[PDB]
Every structure is written in C-alpha cells, then in structure tokens.
Amino acid sequence: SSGSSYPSLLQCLKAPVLSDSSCKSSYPGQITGNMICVGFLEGGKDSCQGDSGGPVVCNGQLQGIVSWGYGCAQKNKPGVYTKVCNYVNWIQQTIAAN
Amino acid sequence: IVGGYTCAANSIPYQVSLNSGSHFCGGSLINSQWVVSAAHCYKSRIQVRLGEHNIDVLEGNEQFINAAKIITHPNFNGNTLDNDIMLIKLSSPATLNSRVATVSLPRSCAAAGTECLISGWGNT
Ligand SMILES: [Ca+2]
C-alpha cells in the first residue's frame, strides 16, 4: 500500500501556526483567507506529497488540512493548509443533511 | 512528513488512509460516519482505512470501509487550491474504539505560534 516512496509507518510532526503576514510573504499572490501556514521558515520539517487531506491538530482541535506547498521542507516555503475554522458550518450542515 | 518522527502505534486514532489500490491521501475521522479530507484528493471511488499504523501489514486493528458519498466543497478552485476541503461518508459506520476515534472541530481559530501535531504517510 505504501508503493515506491511512501513510508509504511505513520509519521508525526510538531509545528507552529505561522502569522498571516509570514504566510503571504512566503507565497505572494497565492494565499486566500481560507489558508493558513504551519511549519518552519528555516525549512527542514514539513508535510509532503502523500500527506494531503490529513490533520493539523492544535490543543485537541482540527485546525488544518494538508493542502499544498512549494516543494517540501524548503526554506521560506512552509506548508499551506486549509483553514478548518472557516468551515465548521459547512461541515456540520453537510453532515446534517447527507 | 519530512523531518518528523514515527508516531506511537495508533496514538493518532482519528488519522485515516485513503486508498484506491494503494495509499494516496490522508483524512480525519470527525464522527463515526464521516471523514474530512482535501478536495484535490477526490476520486470517484475511495476505500477508507481506519486504525492503521503500518499500511502494508495487517496488524489487527484495521477497519476497511468503502465510501458511499464524496462531497467536495462547491467553491473548490482546482488551479489555486482555494476551498480545498472534502467530506467522505462511510458506507457503514466505523466502530469507535481506543484505536479508532474522532477529533473535535475547532471552537475558534488558532493563534499564531500555537503548537500543533501534523501526521501522515506522505513522503519523508
Ligand atoms: Ca496495517
């Protein structure tokens, strides 16, 4: 199931939410209000291909969904995540009606 | 995950693997019937694999459940990945037990500097 490049074992990473200013500075013209940056501006630690869809959990709450980035773990290019605190009503209403 | 560490087995019980023959994306279990993931992970058919640690070896805690519904956010933009969120309904409810569990939705947005936990079977 892991194929040619993915690890067999689930991997974990502790990483901080970054300021909106740092996120837009890292990705000029590409950040909307529905995105947050999480990670390290120094690079070296990040999510990567195969992680998309997975969780960013802060103080027991789902705050991000792995989405995209330029490369992986590159300097000044932290991971970009779907901002889950924009979507609780979409999530709850979709579940309630389906 | 680059530069991370191996999670303790089943210590992230809300983490799921999305499988279409092989692993291709992650997701989070938010109630016994629903996984939230990214819209760019959309496929017409998805098998949700819960209770996993080693995705290549049967360990005994797995539940493999095929999706019954897959709902991408209606304003997803495939060029910019704006609104990159998707909901997957399981064809039967997962059995919630110490290694298969839900994660809470947020009560407010997280402040800059908040430490978080990110996980997955992506490239290392
Ligand atoms: Ca397994």
PDB file of C-alpha atoms and ligand atoms in Angstrom:
ATOM      1  CA  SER A   1       0.000   0.000   0.000  1.00  0.00           C
ATOM      2  CA  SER A   2       2.943   2.377   0.514  1.00  0.00           C
ATOM      3  CA  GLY A   3       4.213   1.677  -3.002  1.00  0.00           C
ATOM      4  CA  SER A   4       7.571   3.059  -4.060  1.00  0.00           C
ATOM      5  CA  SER A   5       8.169   6.189  -1.969  1.00  0.00           C
ATOM      6  CA  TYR A   6       5.769   6.444   0.947  1.00  0.00           C
ATOM      7  CA  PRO A   7       6.699   5.184   4.431  1.00  0.00           C
ATOM      8  CA  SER A   8       4.934   2.169   5.898  1.00  0.00           C
ATOM      9  CA  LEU A   9       4.592   3.720   9.377  1.00  0.00           C
ATOM     10  CA  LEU A  10       2.537   6.795  10.295  1.00  0.00           C
ATOM     11  CA  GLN A  11       4.759   9.857  10.771  1.00  0.00           C
ATOM     12  CA  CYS A  12       4.270  12.739  13.216  1.00  0.00           C
ATOM     13  CA  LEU A  13       5.486  16.340  13.346  1.00  0.00           C
ATOM     14  CA  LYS A  14       5.162  19.166  15.870  1.00  0.00           C
ATOM     15  CA  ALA A  15       4.908  22.516  14.084  1.00  0.00           C
ATOM     16  CA  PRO A  16       3.593  26.022  14.922  1.00  0.00           C
ATOM     17  CA  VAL A  17       0.906  28.089  13.227  1.00  0.00           C
ATOM     18  CA  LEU A  18       2.613  30.968  11.434  1.00  0.00           C
ATOM     19  CA  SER A  19       1.415  34.556  11.245  1.00  0.00           C
ATOM     20  CA  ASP A  20      -0.742  35.550   8.288  1.00  0.00           C
ATOM     21  CA  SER A  21       1.923  38.089   7.308  1.00  0.00           C
ATOM     22  CA  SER A  22       4.649  35.429   7.128  1.00  0.00           C
ATOM     23  CA  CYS A  23       2.355  33.169   5.076  1.00  0.00           C
ATOM     24  CA  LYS A  24       1.574  35.850   2.492  1.00  0.00           C
ATOM     25  CA  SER A  25       5.242  36.907   2.432  1.00  0.00           C
ATOM     26  CA  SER A  26       6.283  33.310   1.692  1.00  0.00           C
ATOM     27  CA  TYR A  27       3.672  32.888  -1.078  1.00  0.00           C
ATOM     28  CA  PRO A  28       2.963  36.321  -2.594  1.00  0.00           C
ATOM     29  CA  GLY A  29      -0.293  36.410  -4.547  1.00  0.00           C
ATOM     30  CA  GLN A  30      -1.266  32.832  -3.659  1.00  0.00           C
ATOM     31  CA  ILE A  31      -2.763  32.915  -0.119  1.00  0.00           C
ATOM     32  CA  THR A  32      -6.514  33.372   0.369  1.00  0.00           C
ATOM     33  CA  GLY A  33      -8.385  33.795   3.634  1.00  0.00           C
ATOM     34  CA  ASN A  34      -9.118  30.043   3.564  1.00  0.00           C
ATOM     35  CA  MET A  35      -5.447  29.090   4.014  1.00  0.00           C
ATOM     36  CA  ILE A  36      -3.012  29.040   6.938  1.00  0.00           C
ATOM     37  CA  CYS A  37       0.712  28.373   7.010  1.00  0.00           C
ATOM     38  CA  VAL A  38       2.060  25.893   9.562  1.00  0.00           C
ATOM     39  CA  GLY A  39       5.701  24.927   9.895  1.00  0.00           C
ATOM     40  CA  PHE A  40       9.200  26.406   9.920  1.00  0.00           C
ATOM     41  CA  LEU A  41      10.546  29.250   7.795  1.00  0.00           C
ATOM     42  CA  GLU A  42      14.016  27.695   8.173  1.00  0.00           C
ATOM     43  CA  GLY A  43      12.737  24.598   6.338  1.00  0.00           C
ATOM     44  CA  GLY A  44      13.773  21.053   7.198  1.00  0.00           C
ATOM     45  CA  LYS A  45      10.409  19.960   8.674  1.00  0.00           C
ATOM     46  CA  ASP A  46       7.134  19.906   6.744  1.00  0.00           C
ATOM     47  CA  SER A  47       4.348  17.801   5.315  1.00  0.00           C
ATOM     48  CA  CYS A  48       4.804  16.467   1.773  1.00  0.00           C
ATOM     49  CA  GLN A  49       3.172  14.534  -1.083  1.00  0.00           C
ATOM     50  CA  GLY A  50       1.004  11.750   0.297  1.00  0.00           C
ATOM     51  CA  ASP A  51       0.055  13.797   3.379  1.00  0.00           C
ATOM     52  CA  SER A  52      -2.729  15.826   1.693  1.00  0.00           C
ATOM     53  CA  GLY A  53      -6.113  15.536   3.349  1.00  0.00           C
ATOM     54  CA  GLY A  54      -4.562  14.709   6.712  1.00  0.00           C
ATOM     55  CA  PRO A  55      -4.830  16.559  10.004  1.00  0.00           C
ATOM     56  CA  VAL A  56      -3.243  19.515  11.739  1.00  0.00           C
ATOM     57  CA  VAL A  57      -4.472  19.295  15.338  1.00  0.00           C
ATOM     58  CA  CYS A  58      -3.800  22.062  17.871  1.00  0.00           C
ATOM     59  CA  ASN A  59      -4.841  21.790  21.526  1.00  0.00           C
ATOM     60  CA  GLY A  60      -7.115  18.888  20.619  1.00  0.00           C
ATOM     61  CA  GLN A  61      -8.872  20.691  17.730  1.00  0.00           C
ATOM     62  CA  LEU A  62      -8.591  20.111  13.985  1.00  0.00           C
ATOM     63  CA  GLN A  63      -7.323  23.441  12.627  1.00  0.00           C
ATOM     64  CA  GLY A  64      -5.770  22.486   9.279  1.00  0.00           C
ATOM     65  CA  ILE A  65      -5.952  20.050   6.381  1.00  0.00           C
ATOM     66  CA  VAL A  66      -2.756  19.244   4.484  1.00  0.00           C
ATOM     67  CA  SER A  67      -3.122  21.038   1.150  1.00  0.00           C
ATOM     68  CA  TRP A  68      -0.058  22.294  -0.739  1.00  0.00           C
ATOM     69  CA  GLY A  69       3.338  23.982  -0.732  1.00  0.00           C
ATOM     70  CA  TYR A  70       6.332  24.729  -2.929  1.00  0.00           C
ATOM     71  CA  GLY A  71       8.471  21.609  -2.665  1.00  0.00           C
ATOM     72  CA  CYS A  72       8.687  20.077   0.801  1.00  0.00           C
ATOM     73  CA  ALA A  73      10.573  21.454   3.812  1.00  0.00           C
ATOM     74  CA  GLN A  74      12.121  24.231   1.702  1.00  0.00           C
ATOM     75  CA  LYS A  75      13.361  27.442   3.301  1.00  0.00           C
ATOM     76  CA  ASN A  76      10.754  30.244   3.414  1.00  0.00           C
ATOM     77  CA  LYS A  77       8.177  27.835   1.926  1.00  0.00           C
ATOM     78  CA  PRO A  78       6.195  26.354   4.825  1.00  0.00           C
ATOM     79  CA  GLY A  79       3.251  24.060   4.274  1.00  0.00           C
ATOM     80  CA  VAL A  80      -0.079  25.635   3.317  1.00  0.00           C
ATOM     81  CA  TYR A  81      -3.190  24.163   4.941  1.00  0.00           C
ATOM     82  CA  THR A  82      -6.938  24.526   4.531  1.00  0.00           C
ATOM     83  CA  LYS A  83      -8.165  26.731   7.408  1.00  0.00           C
ATOM     84  CA  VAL A  84     -10.685  24.483   9.184  1.00  0.00           C
ATOM     85  CA  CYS A  85     -12.051  27.236  11.466  1.00  0.00           C
ATOM     86  CA  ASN A  86     -13.639  28.729   8.319  1.00  0.00           C
ATOM     87  CA  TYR A  87     -15.677  25.582   7.615  1.00  0.00           C
ATOM     88  CA  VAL A  88     -17.397  24.293  10.782  1.00  0.00           C
ATOM     89  CA  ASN A  89     -20.800  25.398   9.473  1.00  0.00           C
ATOM     90  CA  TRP A  90     -20.168  23.850   6.036  1.00  0.00           C
ATOM     91  CA  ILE A  91     -19.027  20.632   7.731  1.00  0.00           C
ATOM     92  CA  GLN A  92     -21.897  20.425  10.227  1.00  0.00           C
ATOM     93  CA  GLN A  93     -24.608  21.398   7.742  1.00  0.00           C
ATOM     94  CA  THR A  94     -23.308  18.981   5.091  1.00  0.00           C
ATOM     95  CA  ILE A  95     -23.218  16.119   7.600  1.00  0.00           C
ATOM     96  CA  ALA A  96     -26.654  17.006   8.985  1.00  0.00           C
ATOM     97  CA  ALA A  97     -28.254  16.833   5.514  1.00  0.00           C
ATOM     98  CA  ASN A  98     -26.421  13.852   3.996  1.00  0.00           C
TER      99      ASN A  98
ATOM    100  CA  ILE B   1       6.176  14.148   6.629  1.00  0.00           C
ATOM    101  CA  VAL B   2       9.785  15.380   6.305  1.00  0.00           C
ATOM    102  CA  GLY B   3      11.876  15.765   9.438  1.00  0.00           C
ATOM    103  CA  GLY B   4       9.299  14.162  11.721  1.00  0.00           C
ATOM    104  CA  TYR B   5       9.270  11.093  13.947  1.00  0.00           C
ATOM    105  CA  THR B   6       7.370   7.812  13.888  1.00  0.00           C
ATOM    106  CA  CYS B   7       4.067   8.139  15.747  1.00  0.00           C
ATOM    107  CA  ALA B   8       3.445   5.634  18.511  1.00  0.00           C
ATOM    108  CA  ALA B   9       1.192   2.956  17.036  1.00  0.00           C
ATOM    109  CA  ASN B  10      -2.472   4.064  16.981  1.00  0.00           C
ATOM    110  CA  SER B  11      -1.680   7.193  19.017  1.00  0.00           C
ATOM    111  CA  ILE B  12      -3.391   9.311  16.308  1.00  0.00           C
ATOM    112  CA  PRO B  13      -6.683   7.362  16.256  1.00  0.00           C
ATOM    113  CA  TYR B  14      -8.510   9.944  14.075  1.00  0.00           C
ATOM    114  CA  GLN B  15      -5.965   9.573  11.240  1.00  0.00           C
ATOM    115  CA  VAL B  16      -7.188   7.593   8.226  1.00  0.00           C
ATOM    116  CA  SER B  17      -5.544   6.493   4.976  1.00  0.00           C
ATOM    117  CA  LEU B  18      -7.445   6.989   1.709  1.00  0.00           C
ATOM    118  CA  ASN B  19      -6.818   4.014  -0.573  1.00  0.00           C
ATOM    119  CA  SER B  20      -7.631   3.286  -4.226  1.00  0.00           C
ATOM    120  CA  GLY B  21      -5.429   0.228  -4.591  1.00  0.00           C
ATOM    121  CA  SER B  22      -2.682   1.990  -2.662  1.00  0.00           C
ATOM    122  CA  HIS B  23      -2.458   4.879  -0.213  1.00  0.00           C
ATOM    123  CA  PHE B  24      -2.815   8.278  -1.874  1.00  0.00           C
ATOM    124  CA  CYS B  25      -4.084  10.772   0.764  1.00  0.00           C
ATOM    125  CA  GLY B  26      -4.923  11.201   4.437  1.00  0.00           C
ATOM    126  CA  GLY B  27      -8.076  12.238   6.276  1.00  0.00           C
ATOM    127  CA  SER B  28      -9.508  12.808   9.750  1.00  0.00           C
ATOM    128  CA  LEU B  29     -12.462  10.993  11.329  1.00  0.00           C
ATOM    129  CA  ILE B  30     -14.925  13.538  12.731  1.00  0.00           C
ATOM    130  CA  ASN B  31     -17.868  11.256  13.511  1.00  0.00           C
ATOM    131  CA  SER B  32     -18.450   7.533  13.084  1.00  0.00           C
ATOM    132  CA  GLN B  33     -19.740   8.060   9.513  1.00  0.00           C
ATOM    133  CA  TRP B  34     -17.688  10.960   8.142  1.00  0.00           C
ATOM    134  CA  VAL B  35     -14.062  11.731   7.254  1.00  0.00           C
ATOM    135  CA  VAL B  36     -12.853  15.214   6.314  1.00  0.00           C
ATOM    136  CA  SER B  37     -10.039  15.488   3.755  1.00  0.00           C
ATOM    137  CA  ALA B  38      -8.871  17.705   0.880  1.00  0.00           C
ATOM    138  CA  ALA B  39     -10.899  18.232  -2.286  1.00  0.00           C
ATOM    139  CA  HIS B  40      -7.875  17.682  -4.514  1.00  0.00           C
ATOM    140  CA  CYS B  41      -7.786  14.129  -3.106  1.00  0.00           C
ATOM    141  CA  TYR B  42     -11.079  13.446  -4.921  1.00  0.00           C
ATOM    142  CA  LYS B  43     -11.508  10.092  -6.656  1.00  0.00           C
ATOM    143  CA  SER B  44     -14.738   8.532  -7.881  1.00  0.00           C
ATOM    144  CA  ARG B  45     -14.139   5.543  -5.568  1.00  0.00           C
ATOM    145  CA  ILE B  46     -12.273   5.608  -2.242  1.00  0.00           C
ATOM    146  CA  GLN B  47     -11.669   2.968   0.430  1.00  0.00           C
ATOM    147  CA  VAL B  48     -11.191   4.462   3.902  1.00  0.00           C
ATOM    148  CA  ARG B  49      -8.683   2.603   6.089  1.00  0.00           C
ATOM    149  CA  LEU B  50      -9.013   3.278   9.825  1.00  0.00           C
ATOM    150  CA  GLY B  51      -6.971   2.004  12.753  1.00  0.00           C
ATOM    151  CA  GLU B  52      -3.790   1.865  10.658  1.00  0.00           C
ATOM    152  CA  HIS B  53      -0.168   2.161  11.711  1.00  0.00           C
ATOM    153  CA  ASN B  54       1.789   0.068   9.162  1.00  0.00           C
ATOM    154  CA  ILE B  55      -0.266   0.499   5.966  1.00  0.00           C
ATOM    155  CA  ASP B  56       1.478  -2.501   4.333  1.00  0.00           C
ATOM    156  CA  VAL B  57       0.966  -5.108   7.076  1.00  0.00           C
ATOM    157  CA  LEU B  58      -2.266  -6.389   8.616  1.00  0.00           C
ATOM    158  CA  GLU B  59      -1.900  -5.722  12.349  1.00  0.00           C
ATOM    159  CA  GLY B  60      -5.406  -6.479  13.659  1.00  0.00           C
ATOM    160  CA  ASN B  61      -6.891  -3.047  14.444  1.00  0.00           C
ATOM    161  CA  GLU B  62      -7.786  -2.024  10.882  1.00  0.00           C
ATOM    162  CA  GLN B  63     -11.238  -1.254   9.505  1.00  0.00           C
ATOM    163  CA  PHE B  64     -11.560  -1.016   5.706  1.00  0.00           C
ATOM    164  CA  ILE B  65     -14.784   0.757   4.682  1.00  0.00           C
ATOM    165  CA  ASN B  66     -15.651   1.953   1.180  1.00  0.00           C
ATOM    166  CA  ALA B  67     -17.032   5.458   0.682  1.00  0.00           C
ATOM    167  CA  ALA B  68     -20.753   5.827  -0.021  1.00  0.00           C
ATOM    168  CA  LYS B  69     -20.667   9.595  -0.721  1.00  0.00           C
ATOM    169  CA  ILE B  70     -17.862  12.009  -1.582  1.00  0.00           C
ATOM    170  CA  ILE B  71     -18.667  15.728  -1.380  1.00  0.00           C
ATOM    171  CA  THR B  72     -16.132  18.357  -2.438  1.00  0.00           C
ATOM    172  CA  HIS B  73     -16.574  21.967  -1.385  1.00  0.00           C
ATOM    173  CA  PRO B  74     -18.689  23.624  -4.114  1.00  0.00           C
ATOM    174  CA  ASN B  75     -16.249  26.551  -4.420  1.00  0.00           C
ATOM    175  CA  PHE B  76     -13.057  24.473  -4.633  1.00  0.00           C
ATOM    176  CA  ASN B  77     -10.678  26.047  -7.169  1.00  0.00           C
ATOM    177  CA  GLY B  78      -8.514  23.406  -8.816  1.00  0.00           C
ATOM    178  CA  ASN B  79      -5.979  25.966 -10.070  1.00  0.00           C
ATOM    179  CA  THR B  80      -5.307  27.727  -6.752  1.00  0.00           C
ATOM    180  CA  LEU B  81      -6.493  25.011  -4.297  1.00  0.00           C
ATOM    181  CA  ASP B  82      -8.762  27.553  -2.566  1.00  0.00           C
ATOM    182  CA  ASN B  83     -11.531  25.852  -0.539  1.00  0.00           C
ATOM    183  CA  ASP B  84      -9.523  22.605  -0.551  1.00  0.00           C
ATOM    184  CA  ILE B  85     -11.861  20.537   1.627  1.00  0.00           C
ATOM    185  CA  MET B  86     -13.910  17.383   1.082  1.00  0.00           C
ATOM    186  CA  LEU B  87     -16.246  15.169   3.131  1.00  0.00           C
ATOM    187  CA  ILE B  88     -16.412  11.369   2.758  1.00  0.00           C
ATOM    188  CA  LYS B  89     -19.386   9.365   4.047  1.00  0.00           C
ATOM    189  CA  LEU B  90     -18.563   5.789   5.047  1.00  0.00           C
ATOM    190  CA  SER B  91     -20.839   3.111   3.608  1.00  0.00           C
ATOM    191  CA  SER B  92     -21.210   1.699   7.129  1.00  0.00           C
ATOM    192  CA  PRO B  93     -20.318   3.393  10.429  1.00  0.00           C
ATOM    193  CA  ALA B  94     -16.839   2.807  11.764  1.00  0.00           C
ATOM    194  CA  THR B  95     -16.612   1.058  15.131  1.00  0.00           C
ATOM    195  CA  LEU B  96     -15.154   3.667  17.510  1.00  0.00           C
ATOM    196  CA  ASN B  97     -12.647   2.006  19.843  1.00  0.00           C
ATOM    197  CA  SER B  98      -9.400   3.077  21.558  1.00  0.00           C
ATOM    198  CA  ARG B  99      -7.543   2.985  18.204  1.00  0.00           C
ATOM    199  CA  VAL B 100     -10.331   4.458  16.006  1.00  0.00           C
ATOM    200  CA  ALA B 101     -11.672   7.744  17.370  1.00  0.00           C
ATOM    201  CA  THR B 102     -12.897  11.187  16.349  1.00  0.00           C
ATOM    202  CA  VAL B 103     -11.145  14.561  16.551  1.00  0.00           C
ATOM    203  CA  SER B 104     -13.042  17.672  17.627  1.00  0.00           C
ATOM    204  CA  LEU B 105     -13.772  20.548  15.255  1.00  0.00           C
ATOM    205  CA  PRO B 106     -12.379  23.938  16.329  1.00  0.00           C
ATOM    206  CA  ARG B 107     -14.188  26.258  18.717  1.00  0.00           C
ATOM    207  CA  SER B 108     -12.125  29.222  17.454  1.00  0.00           C
ATOM    208  CA  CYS B 109      -9.183  29.836  15.152  1.00  0.00           C
ATOM    209  CA  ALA B 110      -5.686  29.054  16.445  1.00  0.00           C
ATOM    210  CA  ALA B 111      -3.365  31.909  17.354  1.00  0.00           C
ATOM    211  CA  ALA B 112      -0.077  32.326  15.532  1.00  0.00           C
ATOM    212  CA  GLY B 113       2.587  30.450  17.459  1.00  0.00           C
ATOM    213  CA  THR B 114       0.235  27.682  18.618  1.00  0.00           C
ATOM    214  CA  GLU B 115       1.980  24.298  18.546  1.00  0.00           C
ATOM    215  CA  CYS B 116       0.176  21.636  16.508  1.00  0.00           C
ATOM    216  CA  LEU B 117       0.556  17.983  15.538  1.00  0.00           C
ATOM    217  CA  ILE B 118       0.677  17.055  11.823  1.00  0.00           C
ATOM    218  CA  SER B 119       0.654  13.436  10.667  1.00  0.00           C
ATOM    219  CA  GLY B 120       0.542  11.258   7.572  1.00  0.00           C
ATOM    220  CA  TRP B 121       2.044   8.586   5.351  1.00  0.00           C
ATOM    221  CA  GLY B 122       3.467  11.097   2.868  1.00  0.00           C
ATOM    222  CA  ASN B 123       6.993  11.289   1.541  1.00  0.00           C
ATOM    223  CA  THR B 124       9.721  11.642   4.156  1.00  0.00           C
TER     224      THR B 124
HETATM  225 CA    CA C   1      -1.954  -2.209   8.768  1.00  0.00          CA
END
